[PDB]
C-alpha cells in the first residue's frame, strides 16, 4: 500500500551490487546516492535518494557509515535492504 517502505532484494554480482551508499551533512542516515544502470541494485528496486532503514532484517538507523557498509557486506550472495523514498519536513 501507499507510503510503505520497500524491501529490495539484491543478488550480488561479480562487481558487487552497483550502488553508492552516502552519509548526509545535514540529515542523519545512510542514503543511496546513485545506482549503476543495469546493476543488481537497479534490478532490486533501489533508487537514488532512497534512505536505508534495515539491512538483512536489522535496523541500521543508529549506526556509523562503516558499520552499515559492513552489514551490507555480511552475506556473500545477497543483501536485503528496506528503504524509503525521500522526505522533507515543511
Resolution of the PDB structure in angstroms: 1.5
Experimental method: X-ray
Helix boundaries (H) for 1-90: 40-44, 65-72
Question: At a CB cut-off of 8 Å and minimum separation 6, what does 13 contact?
Answer: 39, 40
Query: To which residue does cell 559492513 refer?
Result: 70
Query: To which residue does cell 528496506 refer?
Result: 82
**87 three-state secondary structure:** coil
Task: Tell me whether strands 51-55 and 19-23 are parallel, antiparallel or unpaired.
Answer: unpaired
Domains of the chain by start residue, with CATH: 1-90 (2.30.42.10)
With contact defined as beta carbons under 8 Å apart, do 20 and 42 qualify?
no
Amino acid at each position: 500500500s501507499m507510503l510503505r517502505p520497500r524491501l529490495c532484494h539484491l543478488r550480488k554480482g561479480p562487481q558487487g551490487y552497483g550502488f553508492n551508499l552516502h552519509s548526509d551533512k545535514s540529515r542523519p542516515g545512510q542514503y543511496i546516492r546513485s545506482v549503476d544502470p543495469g546493476s543488481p541494485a537497479a534490478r532490486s528496486g533501489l533508487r537514488a535518494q532512497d534512505r536505508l532503514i534495515e539491512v538483512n532484517g536489522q535496523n541500521v538507523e543508529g549506526l556509523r557509515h562503516a558499520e552499515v557498509v559492513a552489514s551490507i557486506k555480511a552475506r556473500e550472495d545477497e543483501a536485503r535492504l528496506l528503504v524509503v523514498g525521500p522526505s522533507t519536513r515543511l
